[PDB]
Every structure is written in structure tokens, then in C-alpha cells.
Design a protein around this ligand. Structure first.
Ligand code: HEC
Ligand code: HEC
Ligand code: HEC
Ligand code: HEC
Ligand SMILES: [Zn+2]
Ligand SMILES: [Zn+2]
Ligand SMILES: [Zn+2]
Ligand SMILES: [Zn+2]
Ligand SMILES: [Zn+2]
Ligand SMILES: [Zn+2]
Ligand SMILES: [Zn+2]
Lengths: 106, 106, 106, 106
């Protein structure tokens, strides 16, 4: 697993999608992101090691991945339909979710 | 890790919600189901062990957990809102997802 | 935009989906169901005409459609992917939602 | 009915959340946005009047509302729970959607 590695996968596969040529490239990218995001679910981050897993921050931290997992789920559907541009637009809109979690837990 | 133990978690906890006397017991059990479902997302079941990880069956398999994870998410909100009975309903409505996936790959 | 006709639309198109021969027949059916569900969202059922629209019953009632709308939304993706059978399965799975709402508000 | 009636409500209720006091003020405003979005789903904007209802921009348009509705839905929960801080957040993340869909039809 490892949290840092999962974030490597996310950041890298997002870039690919920004400069992807076709739907197939977008599928493969989003699919790998989905796996990293699901894997990162139960990772206790550095800045929350002193709290209980029952804490609001840990529930809020896990809540962030629910949002990310859902967006990728739906974004992959667009890719499967051959809609490269609206898949790329949805890939871009993950950033709002990425930034929100970082801004207060990273 | 073990997919068998992930289903054990999902089953056991679904019974816990079935008879819970307060929100805390529901919240906690739902949280355990979420971690299990997110764990099980990456797995490869027995009937598709030899088959490729990129097969239509495996795409639907992963998709089934995307639905379950998404339902567990909304249920937990309902529990967090103190709406215990509605969370218990929502937990019952998961069975459509459990059964649909079982009807085939189990 | 009557609630009875909206429900007539849901039930009739659910039958259409069961015996559909192509993706477009499923797409069209789901789109009609999507409209009926979006339309019925602001409705008040006979059992709660008396009650205020800000009551818990109406929140839970309206919330029922959020789920149905969400489920239809997803099943339409499956239809657009050419996954007709899985779209039919997802349609079959809607009845957990249909029955949950009827078992109390019908 | 009426597009402009629906859309003006969305930015107005945003400004309540922009600087609200409590879960009360936020929970109310969001529910009005939930009714505006569901009513807007069926509507046809002026720019793509000539294009078929089966247009791929009508689908971009409709799909854009499924995401807004879905995001409203989640912010509403956080407000019910008493997470007034996080409901604003989540309400902040709605902007990525608004301006995206606006980057064409507005
Ligand atoms: C929480 C809910 C998060 C979401 C959603 C995303 N990220 Fe994240 N990220 C998060 C944490 C707590 C950390 C710190 C890891 C650590 O051990 O310090 C990160 C880190 C990254 C990094 C690396 C930064 C570093 O200091 O090493 C990257 C490159 C990164 N995150 C990218 C990223 C992307 C692209 C996301 C969505 C598309 C995303 N993250 C979501 C917490 C969370
Ligand atoms: C696929 C998308 C699945 C979903 C969603 C759920 N389950 Fe499952 N389950 C699945 C498989 C492939 C199997 C077989 C595992 C094996 O190796 O035999 C199972 C098995 C179970 C079991 C039996 C436990 C065992 O001895 O292996 C239970 C009790 C079970 N599943 C429960 C369950 C519940 C409660 C679910 C949702 C609420 C659920 N499953 C979803 C595949 C999938
Ligand atoms: C509430 C959240 C509901 C959901 C979700 C669904 N239905 Fe429904 N339905 C609902 C009500 C309150 C009523 C009664 C309408 C009235 O004024 O009497 C209905 C009614 C129907 C009917 C008509 C049956 C009758 O007794 O007259 C049908 C055929 C029907 N509903 C079908 C249906 C289907 C197929 C749904 C999902 C796929 C569904 N409903 C969801 C409230 C709600
Ligand atoms: C499409 C998928 C849209 C989304 C999502 C949002 N908006 Fe929108 N908006 C859209 C259109 C096509 C129009 C033009 C309607 C018309 O005929 O005038 C609008 C208009 C507005 C307006 C009115 C502007 C004015 O006439 O002065 C407002 C205030 C507005 N939109 C706000 C708004 C907000 C706050 C949104 C999300 C939070 C949002 N819109 C999403 C298309 C779409
Ligand atoms: Zn979608
Ligand atoms: Zn777009
Ligand atoms: Zn909900
Ligand atoms: Zn209920
Ligand atoms: Zn889906
Ligand atoms: Zn199926
Ligand atoms: Zn949420």
C-alpha cells in the first residue's frame, strides 16, 4: 500500500490524462488512479497520527476519498463512451478535491 | 487483505446494523464495511483467478464495489444525522448490490 | 407532470428495459425515467399532503428521488457504454429504492 | 419552470452560504438550490435550441446537473450533521462545476 506511493500514482496519471491522445490512454490512467485511491482509504496520514480513527478529522479524511473515488468512477464512464474531452474536463475537476484535502491535511 | 475476510466483515456488520440500539453502533459498523469494501475493490475473485485483470468481468466486479462504497457513504451520513432508522433502511437496500454480484461470480 | 403519471412512466419503462433489444431502447427508456424522477422530486404524495413541505417525511421522501436519480444516471452510462445487460441489471436493482419508498409513503 | 428563475436562485443561495451563521441558514438555502437544479434538468437553454434534445451538448448540459445535484446532496448532509464549516467547503467545490458548464452556455 503506502500512502506516498498512492499519491505518486494519482499525480502521475492525472498529468497523462491532461496530455492524453485518445480514450484508451484515459481509461488506463483513471483505472490506476481508482486503485490507488481505494488503497489510500485506510492510510493514517502524518499530521493525524495522534488522533483516534473515530475522530472527525479521520472521518473527514476518509470522506475526501469517497468524493475522489466517486468522481473517478463517473469519469471512467465518460472515457468508456469515447468522450475524451469530457473525461479530460472531469479529470481536471478532481483538482478541486485534491487541493481541498492537501490544504488542511498535507 | 483476504477477500473472504472482507465479506465476513460486510456480512457480520450488516447484522450489527440490523439490531443496533443507537447511532454509535451503526456509525462504527458502517465505517468497518467501508474499509472492507475499499479493500475488496482491488481483489480478484476465485472464478476469475486465471482470467486477465482487464476483462469485462473484472470491470463489472470493480464497478460493483464502486456502487457498494457509494451506498455505504450515503448511509453513514444518515447515521451521522441521527437518522438511525433511515440508515438501517439504507443498509437493507445494499442487499440488491450484494446479490447482483453474487448471482454471477459467486 | 402529475406524480401518478411519473410513476406510470417509471413502471412502464422498467418493463421496456427488461425486454429491450438494443442500447438505444434502453437509453430512451432510462432518459424518460430520468425525467419522471426529476419531475416527481418536488411532488407531495397523498399520505403527506396535509404535512408541511419542510417536515422530515418530505426530506426523506425527496431524498428517495436523489438516490433513484443517481441510480438512473449511472445505468445510463452503462447503456452508453453498450453494456446493455448490465444496464438491465442496474434497472432491476432500482426496485430496492422503489419498494423502500412505497413501503411507507404509498 | 423558467430557466432564469431556477438559475438566479443558485447564485443567490450561494451568497447565503458564502457568509451564513449556522447549520440552519445553510440547510435551508441548499434545499432551495436542490429544487432549482431538479427543475432546470428538463429545461433547454437558448444557445442549443436548434440542436436536438439528443444533442451531445444537451447531454453535457444534463450531465452537468447530475453532478451539481449530487454535490448539493452531499453538502446538504454535512449541514444536517452540524458540520457547518465543511458544508461551506463542499459548497465552495460546487464552483468548479458552475463555471465549467458556464464555459459554453452562459
Ligand atoms: C485526502 C483526502 C487526500 C486526497 C483526496 C488527495 N490527497 Fe494527495 N496527499 C494527501 C496527504 C495526506 C498527503 C501527504 C502524504 C505524506 O505522507 O506526507 C498527500 C500527498 C500527495 C503528494 C505528495 C506530496 C509529498 O509531500 O510527498 C502528491 C503528489 C499528491 N498528494 C497528489 C494528489 C493528487 C494528484 C490527488 C488527486 C487527484 C490527491 N493527491 C488527492 C491527502 C490527499
Ligand atoms: C462483487 C462485486 C461483490 C459484492 C458487491 C459483494 N460481494 Fe459478497 N462475495 C463476492 C464473492 C465473489 C464472493 C465469493 C468469495 C469466495 O471466495 O467464496 C462473496 C462471498 C460473500 C460471502 C461468503 C463468505 C465466504 O465464506 O466467502 C458473504 C457472507 C458475502 N459475500 C456477503 C456480502 C455482503 C453482505 C455484501 C454487501 C452488503 C456483499 N457480499 C457484496 C462478491 C461480492
Ligand atoms: C418515493 C421516494 C418513491 C420512489 C423512489 C418510487 N415511488 Fe412509485 N410511488 C410513490 C408514491 C407516493 C406513489 C403513490 C402515488 C399516488 O398518488 O397514489 C407511487 C405509486 C407508484 C405506482 C402506482 C401504483 C398505485 O398504487 O397506484 C407505480 C406503478 C410506481 N409507483 C412505480 C414505481 C417504480 C417502478 C419505481 C422505481 C423504479 C418507483 N415507483 C419509485 C413513491 C415513490
Ligand atoms: C449547465 C450545466 C449549468 C450549470 C451546472 C450551472 N449553470 Fe448557471 N446558467 C446556465 C445557463 C445556460 C444559464 C443561462 C440561462 C438564461 O437563459 O439566462 C445560466 C444562468 C445563470 C445565472 C443567471 C445569470 C443572469 O441572467 O444574470 C446565474 C446567476 C447562474 N447561472 C448561476 C449558477 C450557479 C451559482 C451555479 C452553480 C452553483 C450554476 N449557475 C451552474 C448553465 C449552467
Ligand atoms: Zn455521470
Ligand atoms: Zn465539459
Ligand atoms: Zn443522501
Ligand atoms: Zn426509509
Ligand atoms: Zn457506474
Ligand atoms: Zn450484472
Ligand atoms: Zn459525503
Amino acid at each position: 500500500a503506502d500512502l506516498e506511493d498512492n499519491m505518486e500514482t494519482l499525480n502521475d496519471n492525472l498529468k497523462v490524462i491532461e496530455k492524453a491522445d485518445n480514450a484508451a490512454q484515459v481509461k488506463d490512467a483513471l483505472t490506476k488512479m481508482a486503485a490507488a485511491a481505494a488503497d489510500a482509504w485506510s492510510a493514517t496520514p502524518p499530521k493525524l497520527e495522534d488522533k483516534s480513527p473515530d475522530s472527525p478529522e479521520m472521518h473527514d479524511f476518509r470522506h475526501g476519498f469517497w468524493i475522489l473515488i466517486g468522481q473517478i468512477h463517473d469519469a471512467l464512464h465518460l472515457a468508456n463512451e469515447g468522450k475524451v474531452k469530457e473525461a479530460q474536463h472531469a479529470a481536471e475537476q478532481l483538482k478541486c478535491t485534491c487541493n481541498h484535502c492537501h490544504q488542511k491535511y498535507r
